[PDB]
Nucleic acid binder design. Structure first.
Lengths: 95, 348, 95, 338, 339, 339
DNA sequence: GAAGCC
DNA sequence: CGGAAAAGAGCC
DNA sequence: CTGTGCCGTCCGTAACGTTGTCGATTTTTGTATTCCGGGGCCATGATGCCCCGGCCTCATTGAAGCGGCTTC
DNA sequence: AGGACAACGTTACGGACGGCACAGCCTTTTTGCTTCAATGAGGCCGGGGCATCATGGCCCCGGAATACGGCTCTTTTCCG
């Protein structure tokens, strides 16, 4: 039980930005100039909107999660006119 | 009886084979930095273990965060010769490892387990034969005059008078089997794939595949040790494998059944997939060694073997080898309590 | 047969920006500081990546479509930590 | 050997020669002398090169990881065959009822002597003499006379219960030499589950800290702190802290809730009776933990031999001596009544 | 497809913003419709519109019409060709034979007098001996149903249907808001009067005219014209054939909007300025009313013959398609959609 | 009422005062077009014509249309009424009674041939040897005329007009700049093919195609259906009325436009790039051909009944009015405009 | 009378 | 009323 | 009076070069024993609404067939 | 990395607005009448799945709820 969730955030204050950047980067990889992506299950998405949803103000900050498919059929339901679209791979980081 | 909980598992291990790495905590990711130039980063939700394959520096901020998440760092010499391990003042249960220590001091338990512990390795060595025996002509199947003698060794082991005779039988069927091992790879050893099985058990490997064996074995060891610190057992009180420095005396004893399923079934994809060409090697300086060109490939092969979904005989439910290691540890515990009289063994 | 497709574009040059802005705004409504949304069928999404996919360079410009559900169950699979999420309504514009 | 402590969370440990020389900024600051050493206590963010560590692991020298203050993070167990000898012996003598009871008797006689060690001093409630009623003193001596032969681990429990109630009904007699306003111990609980009193907000906090160092200077050697001879574990009871902390249960977490009010630092104006006994000010907590470190670094001598050290080095060499008693060199456990 | 664009504020300034139409009300925009999602465009008389947006709208061939202040519909664009002169010739030559005209009329009456009383008896709000279909009014209105079989000729048709609708007309203020509302009364003698006399005949007049346009657009879609009327002789005030084929749907939709307008309480008497036409509707209710008409025409009902479920606007388009098929002749009888 | 007028200015203003319309231009007053002697009006570019003005205009059914920035006709808006429906039904009933159709068709081919040899006489550019067309040429064309006037049926007019066109095209290469110019070739039989072949063929075909658009807009401004006429009988979306109303004005405008385009020696075949079939006019060549078409309009030729010596669109809607009135009004018949 | 034109 | 256990305290 | 064309001219996007440096949890624990309770999950119908597709209607351009008279 | 991180400190890039300020434009040649090719256009359903939605019967953790055994010192009706 795991999907791919794209976070489309647009805040307003660097004192909240830097924190949101680093935090939600801790969840998934950089995708687009304001939007990241993650591959998560129920518990970790819950802990996402736990770690997120207080780093930001709820008036001057807009963030938006996007629950896509189960992250293995994500390729059909998204296309990238510019560079490629690459779901993050659950792979042992052998580096 | 009948374990119902396996562990789903959030992350998957991080390995560091580069001996010039450097690992910094950065926010929540775990960036590794190389000569002030990054290479990779692990989301600490996605990290399930950490292994440092050699003199790869680490920064104590990472240890504090990792134990603050309790993900087992496992320091490792170059050849994956399991050397170090981190533990946070013991698993917070006592009943499990007191069962362990108690039964260990019972000598009968050790034998009962050393038998099913050694019979479960032969009875999958021979099926690996009858699965990876690369015959070409008058050879398409392994000789039944051998596949009997391994069975003949199985009946020698299910009747072991002691716990040194049984080790002698293990050694006897680790010489015959390895004599017949060279048949397993590339239809017969090709470009210097010299399985000089005489050099088996030699500390620094003399030969290419032995320098890959004594690595796949020596990292299955770590994998079992991590999976034997999850159910809370103590992977150092060995029933018959006495404690040897670098050898978790019981992780060498609950791997014996998975020595052929997980190690000699990754050597026999690394070699049978062109991941070992004798020019892929540090040809000397350790008798022989391996080059990081193929090291980051072999670790990938081993891991993807560890993420293979197979059925477990008791319930036919399919699970990765990792989760299967932990289910089998669970069976070890709930037999240790005497709950389940025998020990379901996972022969194949 | 209609879904809700979110366009997450972030391109570089105003001479291409203004055109992309107005064009793909002609498809759906402004959503976030760089991301719009639309509710489209097969033919009109085809005409989207027809009208888009040449307003932009394909090296220095990144755009990314997002094929969500059929736009009536879009509410479950997206949440907005800031303002609300509102799928565009197919309604007669009686104004 | 002596257990090195990487003290300043600024240091840099390294292996040059056969000594784990530590470093402040590109400056040698201490020689470890690997021949005679033990755990290296790693504090907040003081780092060690991954060459010394691959030597410590080789020679079965556990490497600890404490936070900046001293808060414990997990260990670094070397996968050798020296520590698990110790765990083997601990879990082997563990279920041997004879030596189990023998340890229990030594522990309880030590605790009773240590608690009765609060005569003339501490208890200053003089009036006519702080010198404890010779009735009480001789009753404790008679209690030890009992405890040096108690043929069960349930006779010992009753003995300890009686001879803890008696002298938990004498506390205030050694609090201020009387009642400091607010600091008068209601002759009641030692605060087991919830706090019920000021001193019952200090004599379970201080004990809660004593549990920590008796868990960590036990996992500082190959001793499973969760298998205890005295207290039969119940899935989360550091039963080898509790079989072990007894002679220091009065010695430390009592002489630190006392001098925190004997010297009058702690007053009812530092805690709040909030849904329980009390809950200190964070500043009160900080000064209390301070005084705790005063005691922990308060000096003592002669573990088994004339050797004057802080309470942590003794508090670990005690575990070492325990292991040595377990089928090792020492054939009778030294017990350390001051 | 697209969605309707209704422009009712008297001072609207519609100006193109690319493929988004951004209207303006005294230098401030009010709303925007995506031009692809724009189905058609209706303007109330005073609200203006820039010519660039107009001759781009016909460049996108989205039809345009103008209501009056109250929707007289003197303004409706012609797209300069439907490219089906065969259907044009069909319907002209068939109107030039009065047999088809009169028989289509009589089936319109049956279409609005063979299931109309059943649509008012399924939602009647009385207080005593009136809850269910009146027993003395069921057979009384049944006489016209049996007299709507063989229609003699144009003259008598024009009378009884109205007078029989008069019998419906009287009974309009007998379900709405449980008797006459808080200043609402349908004087059944005030229907079909150029000045909107009752506060409700204003609403019914606006509904009838804008549904008249809603039928003209269907006529245009299949090339039919509202110009040539069978019994609705072409009058300068109203589109003839539009009436000729909206008359059965006057009750089911055009009367339904006013019925649901009064009963659901969104129609309040405190929304008028009067004595001009007898009564006149202001904002805050007309904006509510016409959108109220809008919700009804978008929900979906099965076709009795084609057995598939279709939207009322699409249903009207299919009704015109069925007229074309009748011009072909596979259907001797027009499918009149009695509920 | 009177002859129509048209407006251009890209930021002008059309407004109504009482009984007249003034086409203001950025708040600049112009002559007050009296509504008592005006007719349909076009709007070029992003003009401004108020909605109330067109409500008041459509009260009397005076038409209006929408063009490009220049004069590329696209759109129209029309009101309902009784005159409009009367015109449509009169056209379609005259689309059923064939004797009037032939009364118009005979004279239509006859006038085509008459204007054809009139164009031969006028545009004779055979200087040096023949300052006149051969008397046999005009004699045979008048023979074609008397042949075409023999039409009591819906028939041979086709073939006789084909023969007349064939002979005219045989001499229409003589209508060139002085002789059979190489690269200016002309083949009598292969005219009007699906692709063009000669630049001359392309100009003739394009001229007819463009003239058909002004014919159909003249049809559309009045209430006559442009889709119904029998010289090219109405079948699958023809400008059939226009197709029945185009032949004698081929020599008047379209052929004349080709003549003044190719004789005047401005456009060069460098713009006539070779296509697969025929030298189609490039952007500049097409634009100059359009300019020649326009210059074919403004020059002043009147008919004796209505002394309007103004232009040819004042002569291009006059015959639309003549046809409408022959259907309905008091004009005795439909004249030929044989110059 | 025959076939290209139209 | 001097005993004496039984209760309940304390604490384990 | 609607692009549209740069001229601006702010935000709020991320990179990187600076000194912070911070922070540690929590106040028992005496034997046992049977609930109390939700962490939680393979396992199992169950129903959903994602389309697999596919023969039912429409249509719109030219393959395709061909009006009559003069000349060769 | 000698605390190796986190917070902050100012200036690369974008994104949208809005501020003014110019223009200001656009459209193939087919008409002789059937029948259809037939490829585009949806519209009802066959049963091809299927992501959670209930169990749910377990696995237990992991505290808590009593529920007592124990030792000495004191403390309500009672036996003798």
């Amino acid at each position: 039980m795991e999907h791919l969730y794209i976070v489309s955030y647009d805040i307003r204050n660097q004192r909240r930005w830097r924190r949101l950047f680093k935090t939600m980067h801790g969840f998934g990889c950089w995708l687009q100039l304001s939007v990241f992506q993650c591959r998560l299950d129920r518990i970790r998405i819950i802990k996402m909107e736990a770690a997120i949803n207080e780093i930001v103000n709820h008036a001057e900050d807009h963030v938006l999660i996007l629950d896509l498919g189960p992250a293995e059929n994500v390729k059909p339901k998204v296309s990238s006119i510019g560079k490629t679209f690459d779901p993050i791979l659950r792979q042992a980081v052998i580096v | 009886p009948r374990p119902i909980i396996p562990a789903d598992g959030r992350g998957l291990p991080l390995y560091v084979q580069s001996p010039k790495a450097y690992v910094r905590k950065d926010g929540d990711c775990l960036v590794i930095e190389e000569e002030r130039v990054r290479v990779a980063e692990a989301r600490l939700g996605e990290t399930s273990q950490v292994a440092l394959f050699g003199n790869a520096t680490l920064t104590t901020a990472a240890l504090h965060e990792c134990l603050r998440r309790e993900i087992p760092v496992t320091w490792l010499s170059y050849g994956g010769w399991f050397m170090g391990h981190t533990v946070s003042t013991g698993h917070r249960n006592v009943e499990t490892r007191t069962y362990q220590y108690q039964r260990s001091f019972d000598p009968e338990t050790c034998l009962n387990l050393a038998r099913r512990w050694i019979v479960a390795k032969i009875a999958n060595c021979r099926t690996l034969l009858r699965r990876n025996w690369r015959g070409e002509g008058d050879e398409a199947k392994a000789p039944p005059g051998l596949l009997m003698s391994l069975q003949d060794d199985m009946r020698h082991a299910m009747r072991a008078p002691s716990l040194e005779v049984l080790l002698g039988i293990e050694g006897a069927s680790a010489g015959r089997y390895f004599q017949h091992f060279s048949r397993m790879l590339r239809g017969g050893d090709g470009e210097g794939m010299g399985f000089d099985f005489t050099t088996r058990n030699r500390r620094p490997p003399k030969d290419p595949v032995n320098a890959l064996l004594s690595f796949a074995y020596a990292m299955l060891t770590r994998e079992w040790t991590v999976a034997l610190a999850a159910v809370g057992l103590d992977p150092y009180r060995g029933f018959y494998h006495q404690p040897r420095f670098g050898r978790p005396a019981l992780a060498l004893d609950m791997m014996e059944p998975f020595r052929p399923l997980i190690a000699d079934s990754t050597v026999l994809m690394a070699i049978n997939n062109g991941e070992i060409r004798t020019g892929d090697f540090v040809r000397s300086a350790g008798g022989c060694n391996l080059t990081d060109s193929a090291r980051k490939r072999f670790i990938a092969g081993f891991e993807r073997r560890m993420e293979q979904e197979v059925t477990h005989p008791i319930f036919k439910y399919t699970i990765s080898y990792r989760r299967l290691l932990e289910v089998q540890a669970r069976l070890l515990t709930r037999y240790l309590s005497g709950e389940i009289p025998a020990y379901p063994n996972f022969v194949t």
